Design a protein around this ligand. Structure first.
Ligand SMILES: NC(=O)c1ccc[n+]([C@@H]2O[C@H](COP(=O)([O-])OP(=O)(O)OC[C@H]3O[C@@H](n4cnc5c(N)ncnc54)[C@H](OP(=O)(O)O)[C@@H]3O)[C@@H](O)[C@H]2O)c1
Ligand SMILES: CCC[C@H]1c2ccccc2C=NN1C(=O)/C=C/c1cc(Cc2cnc(N)nc2N)cc(OC)c1OC
Length: 168
């Protein structure tokens, strides 16, 4: 499922629902970033400011990044800056590809009801962090695929890649 104008949400979480430690990933799992890379290249990536800043304000190459903030004067290295959910949606509608929500928690909670696809990496382990995937309405979502992740010297944690589509 990959239509133009589509909104998708992508995240990685541990078994507790931890998605971040003060903007940072509390684990290292190179395969997940690869998965992230695949779903976001040549698309638009939407980030809340805290998440953006946890990435050192560095935009990722080969895609458009939108950063969401209420601060009218916020500016940063080579990203679109937008200031409301409504702004994200207007952009998403006209965009020639997928608008992918990359986080963080606040952004996920308010934008996932507009999304058509969920991509999640479930990491079967627990870590310390302060940011959790939010409570959402799962009743409207349906798991349509799941792939186990490869474990090797570089990837030390059992994990799964899950895709959900909507009921309606
Ligand atoms: N123990 C605790 O205190 C605790 C608990 C949970 C999280 N936190 C923390 O909160 C951060 C990450 O949480 P998060 O994942 O929710 O952050 P995030 O989604 O990545 O980004 C949050 C920010 O994006 C903005 N934003 C979201 N919706 C907007 C809208 N509709 N219009 C305009 N701006 C909007 C805001 O920027 P602006 O602020 O510039 O308006 C907002 O504060 C971390 O730095 C972390 O340490 C701490
Ligand atoms: C993979 C090599 C490096 C690089 C990159 C370079 C060139 C081309 C593509 C990419 C793809 N992204 N790249 C990143 O460093 C990873 C991005 C990233 C993302 C997320 C969010 C995320 C994380 N994971 C998931 N599943 N959802 C997500 N929504 C969080 C991060 O830190 C807080 C990230 O940086 C560590």
């Amino acid at each position: 499922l990959y239509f133009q104008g589509m909104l998708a949400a992508i995240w990685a979480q541990d078994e507790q629902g931890v998605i971040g430690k003060e903007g940072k990933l509390p684990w290292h799992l190179p395969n997940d970033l690869k998965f992230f890379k695949e779903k976001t290249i040549h698309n638009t990536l939407v980030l809340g400011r805290a998440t953006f800043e946890g990435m050192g304000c560095r935009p990722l190459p080969n895609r458009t990044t939108i950063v969401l903030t209420s601060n009218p004067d916020y500016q940063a290295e080579g990203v679109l800056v937008m200031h409301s959910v409504e702004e994200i949606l207007a952009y998403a509608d006209k965009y020639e590809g997928v608008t992918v929500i990359g986080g963080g928690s606040v952004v996920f909670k308010e934008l996932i009801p507009a999304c058509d696809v969920l991509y999640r990496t479930m990491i079967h382990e627990t870590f310390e962090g302060d940011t959790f995937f939010p409570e959402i309405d799962w009743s409207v979502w349906e798991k349509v695929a799941t792939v186990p992740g490869v474990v090797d010297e570089k990837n030390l944690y059992a994990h799964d890649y899950e895709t959900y589509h909507r009921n309606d």
